[PDB]
Structure 1
Amino acid sequence: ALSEIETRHSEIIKLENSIRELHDMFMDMAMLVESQGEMIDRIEYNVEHAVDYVERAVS
C-alpha cells in the first residue's frame, strides 16, 4: 500500500513540474505578446498619418 502510494506520489510531482513550466510559458507568452501589441499600435498611428498626408497632397 505504501510502496504504491510512494511511486504514485512521484508521478504527481512530475506532472506538477510540467504544468508549472507550461503555465509559465503561457504567462510569458501573454506578457510578451501584450508588449508587442503596443509597438504595433504605434506603427498603425504612424502609418495613418503618412497615408493622410499623401491623400491631402494629391488633393
Structure 2
Amino acid sequence: ENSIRELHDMFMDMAMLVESQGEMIDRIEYNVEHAVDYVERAVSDTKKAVK
C-alpha cells in the first residue's frame, strides 16, 4: 500500500504536471495562428508592396 501511496502520490504529481503544462499550449493557441494572422496577411501585402 505504500508502493501504492508512492505511485499514487507521484501520480497526483504527474496528473498535475501535465495539467499545469497543458495550458501553456493554450498560451501558444494565440501565438500559433494569430501569429500566422500576422505573417500571411502581411506577406500578402509585401508581395503587393512591390506593386
Q: Per the alignment, in what secondary structure is the counterpart of residue 37 of structure 1?
A: helix
Q: Which runs of 4+ in 1 moved over 3 A?
A: none
Where in structure 1 are there 5+ consecutive unaligned residues?
A: 1-15
State the Cα distance separating 1:39 from its structure 2 match: 1.0
Give, in whole Å, the separation in 2 of the partners of 1:34 and 1:48: 23
C-alpha distance in 1, partners of 2:42/2:7? Answer: 52
The correspondence for 2:18, drawn from 27, 33, 50, is: 33
Q: Where in structure 2 are there 5+ consecutive unaligned residues?
A: 45-51
1:45 is displaced (CA, Å) by: 1.4
TM-score (norm 1): 0.65
Q: Percent of aligned positions with the same letter in both sequences?
A: 100
After TM superposition, the score normalised by the length of structure 2 is: 0.72
Radius of gyration: which is bigger? Answer: 1
CA RMSD of aligned residues (A): 1.1
Shift, 1:33, TM fit: 0.6
Following superposition, the deviation at residue 47 of structure 1 comes to 2.2
More helix by share: 1
